[PDB]
Amino acid sequence: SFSGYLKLTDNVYIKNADIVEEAKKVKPTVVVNAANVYLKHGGGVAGALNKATNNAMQVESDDYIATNGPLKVGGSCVLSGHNLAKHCLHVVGPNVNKGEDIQLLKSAYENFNQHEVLLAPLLSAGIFGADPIHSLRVCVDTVRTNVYLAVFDKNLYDKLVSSF
């Protein structure tokens, strides 16, 4: 199971870790990807997870988009987890650097409630431009299932914990 996490609430836990390395160690049922609507996994969490799959995630994703079209901001889809997890839940948080509505962050986190346990990043953090402290608050106030959050940056992790 998951190891070395700090308990934040009844159902939310946090660790200073690269989500990709955590997925390789744990091989969880569900790993969350910080996706965009096109499932173009270029950088951040998505680029890192895709690289770890040897680009198989991107090939699968391109076929999904060719069939279904883009996701919605706030939406998700379940695809394979490849070598990292049984499933990858690709969740689109709003990208504030693209002008997307930050109120869609709660909708994005609601997708987590469809899964009993998830390994996940903070949505809309990092290159998506939102305040990670706000993202953690929305996570705790929205997700009811068991969420193991991996935060790569140690200073941000320490700030998240000490201001919680």
Ligand X SMILES: Cc1ccnc(C2CCN(c3ncnc4[nH]ccc34)CC2)n1
How is residue 92 written in tokens? 């689109």
d(CA 118, CA 89): 9
- Of 62, 131, 153, 158, the one binding ligand X by CB under 6 A: 153
Q: Is 150 among the residues that bind ligand X (CB under 6 A)?
A: yes
Rg of the Cα trace of the chain? Answer: 14
Using CB positions, name the residue nearest to ligand X: 126
Q: Is 126 among the residues that bind ligand X (CB under 6 A)?
A: yes
Q: Is 152 among the residues that bind ligand X (CB under 6 A)?
A: yes
- Compute φ and ψ for 94, nearest 5 degrees: -65, 140
Q: How far is the CB of 46 from ligand X (least distance, A)?
A: 8
- Of 6, 78, 102, 156, the one binding ligand X by CB under 6 A: 156
d(CA 39, CA 138): 23
CA angle 34, 40, 46 (to 5 degrees): 30
- Of 6, 27, 29, 44, the one binding ligand X by CB under 6 A: 44
Q: Is 109 among the residues that bind ligand X (CB under 6 A)?
A: no
Q: Is 125 among the residues that bind ligand X (CB under 6 A)?
A: yes
Which residues here bind ligand X, judged by CB under 6 A? 18-20, 44-45, 48, 121, 125-126, 150-153, 156
